[PDB]
Amino acid sequence: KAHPPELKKFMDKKLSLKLNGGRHVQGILRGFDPFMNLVIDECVEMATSGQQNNIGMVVIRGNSIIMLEALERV
Amino acid sequence: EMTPEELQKREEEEFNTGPLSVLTQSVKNNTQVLINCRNNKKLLGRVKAFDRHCNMVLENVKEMWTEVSKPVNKDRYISKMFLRGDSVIVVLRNPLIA
Amino acid sequence: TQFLPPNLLALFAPRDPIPYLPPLEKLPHEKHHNQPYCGIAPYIREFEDPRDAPPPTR
Amino acid sequence: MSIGVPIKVLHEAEGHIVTCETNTGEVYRGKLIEAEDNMNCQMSNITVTYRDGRVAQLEQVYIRGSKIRFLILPDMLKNAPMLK
Amino acid sequence: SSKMLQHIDYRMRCILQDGRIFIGTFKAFDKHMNLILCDCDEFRKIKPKNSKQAEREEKRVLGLVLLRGENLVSMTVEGPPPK
Amino acid sequence: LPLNPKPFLNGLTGKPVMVKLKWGMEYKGYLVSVDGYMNMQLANTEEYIDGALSGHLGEVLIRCNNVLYIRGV
Amino acid sequence: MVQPINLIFRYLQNRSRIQVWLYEQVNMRIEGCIIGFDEYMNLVLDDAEEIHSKTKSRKQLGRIMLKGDNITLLQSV
Amino acid sequence: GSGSVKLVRFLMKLSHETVTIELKNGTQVHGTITGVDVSMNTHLKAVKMTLKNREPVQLETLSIRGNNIRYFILPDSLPLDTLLVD
Amino acid sequence: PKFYCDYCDTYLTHDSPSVRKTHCSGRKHKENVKDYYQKWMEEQAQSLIDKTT
RNA sequence: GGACUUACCUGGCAGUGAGGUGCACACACUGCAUAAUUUGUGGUAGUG
RNA sequence: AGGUAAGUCC
Ligand SMILES: [K+]
Ligand SMILES: [Mg+2]
Ligand SMILES: [Mg+2]
Ligand SMILES: [Mg+2]
Ligand SMILES: [Mg+2]
Ligand SMILES: [Mg+2]
Ligand SMILES: [Mg+2]
Ligand SMILES: [Mg+2]
Ligand SMILES: [Mg+2]
Ligand SMILES: [Zn+2]
């Protein structure tokens, strides 16, 4: 009943992701599932301070992803 | 489901033993219940019926809440309602204080 | 309807982009909760005396 | 059964210009490359319009359906077969 | 479903969760109450920050709109189908 | 030992537990039962508002959606 | 491709210490070791902590189950 | 007794009953139910809608997407035991 | 699970993303579409009824 | 246009219509799975 | 069962 999202196009691409709590994050998309949970790699926090921080190989819950933007050509 | 057979009265077993026993008992014994509701209002009343979502039909409810300066108490009486289950936070059976 | 003669495809033209208007509500994570959700401890005194309760119908 | 008229209409606008307001109150205007049955949308050549009024240009975006308020589709689509 | 079909092709005023109003010609719906509105116009009430000044109604034209069901609150009929 | 959520709770059933709600209140008491949606029935329950004890309640149903985390004693 | 479920399983095995960003709560995070989990993404966290961003001090919890609805993002150390 | 299987099945019986609904956004609706639906979507006629801190407004018809409902306030006389045998 | 193509007046007894895309990038389909909106331009012919007055 | 052949993509479960019985597949309606991330059981709380 | 694609006949 529940189909997977079409994010083959964005695989292994650097993305910038708008997230739930006014949080933004950026990194390389290594994988996904039908809830749109994402695996990001070499991911950077992009805190409001303007300061960026490196956490890598994160899991993002699909639920809390609003929009993603490709930084590199798809 | 884990129970794809068409008589999941596993529904009822849960009702009798599981956590919604709070309701099943309240209904049976006609005990008063206090519900903290997501409008942030307090409903104290009796439970005539309920369902999986904690949809409840209530009787003799007193809705109680706080407004403002210093905080003022407020209450209203509602004699029959249907409450939508999603809007339940917590239900509390009457602890028989005496 | 993507791949048509440009004669017909000119029908599926956007309307002009919409005027900006600011948002109506603040963002949910940045809204100020003046009386946040609160507990039921103060209210127990409201409950009936159990002697004064009605009897179990079944 | 399961598929419904308004989502069809969304898919009919694939390939054209759509505006899309997200839950956050941002607005994305651009070419709708593709849409899924959930309203998740990939778009190209987007003029985003942030809450404040400032705009930006974005190459490629993808938007979760669950986070969309509404879309503006091309008026021609009202003459689609389904809407009759 | 005839409760909804009853109003089809009528002009309907929809209240959204943020308090916008969409008025529009009601072309289609589904199990979610996603809507298709034609010639849809959006209205909104803007509060005066000073305690008493006249409130602004702000129209803004959208055209053909697909409203996600989740953001719908209510619909009432605004007017009869256009000719 | 990979210790998953259903077994974890089943563990704590019987034992005193503290449940923290998304809304910032917490309820302490003897976890009695749980279902597949993780609704919780508590007994001898008491209400802790902002970390420190608010009052003693009783037998309480907590609708699952409201819970943030649950923890032993 | 790395399935998000697998990399959670990777985190479990590694006994890595995971930090969770929360849904719609931006002041608190929670960190701990993932002993177990499920289909809903509920986590069992062995030595959980409450981290408050304004405070920059932590509240110790012990072993917790954190319901999945809350999770926004999973991080390491 | 105990819980019904589904309790919307009750609300669906309330045709021609006049009720007051409170919405999750503070709006109050008073009206006469023409139909209730499995998803608790609710149709009313002869409606007086009173948005939060606004003056009432009368309407010939109103439909409410059910998720928005916090509760129904029912007629004091409504025969519950009858209607609950389900 | 079923899908109805308004353009083709045909059914996909079991719908999927894959199947619907295959159908929609189909020879028969694309022609039916072209036809549908050409037929609509013929509508503009009905404008002449106004043209005559 | 129509018929067949091959390959590829797809396919939830149940009750009834449906009348010799059983199986398979389709259609119609009705349920269930379905209160667990993308709409139908709440971080849009009503908080002025 | 249906769609598509390639082929065979009408
Ligand atoms: K259902
Ligand atoms: Mg919702
Ligand atoms: Mg027969
Ligand atoms: Mg669901
Ligand atoms: Mg839900
Ligand atoms: Mg499920
Ligand atoms: Mg949800
Ligand atoms: Mg849901
Ligand atoms: Mg929901
Ligand atoms: Zn077709």
Author numbering:
A (entry chain G): 3 to 76
B (entry chain D): 10 to 77, 87 to 116
C (entry chain K): 2 to 59
D (entry chain A): 1 to 84
E (entry chain B): 6 to 88
F (entry chain F): 3 to 75
G (entry chain E): 14 to 90
H (entry chain C): -3 to 82
The authors write:
5′-splice site RNA determined at 3.3 Å resolution. snRNA (SmKCm) construct replaces the 4-way junction with a kissing loop. contacts between U1 snRNP and a 5′SS RNA with the consensus sequence. However, U1-C makes no contacts with the RNA bases. sugar-phosphate backbone atoms but makes no contact with RNA bases. Apart from the interaction with U1-70k, U1-C interacts exclusively with SmD3. 16–23 of U1-70k are wedged between SmD3 and SmB. The path of the N-terminal peptide of U1-70k. central hole where it interacts with nucleotides preceding stem-loop IV. is found in the central hole (grey, Mg++; red, water).
Crystal structures of the two sub-structures of U1 snRNP. molecular details of 5′SS recognition by U1 snRNP. intricate network of interactions between the components of U1 snRNP. insights into the molecular mechanism of 5′SS selection.
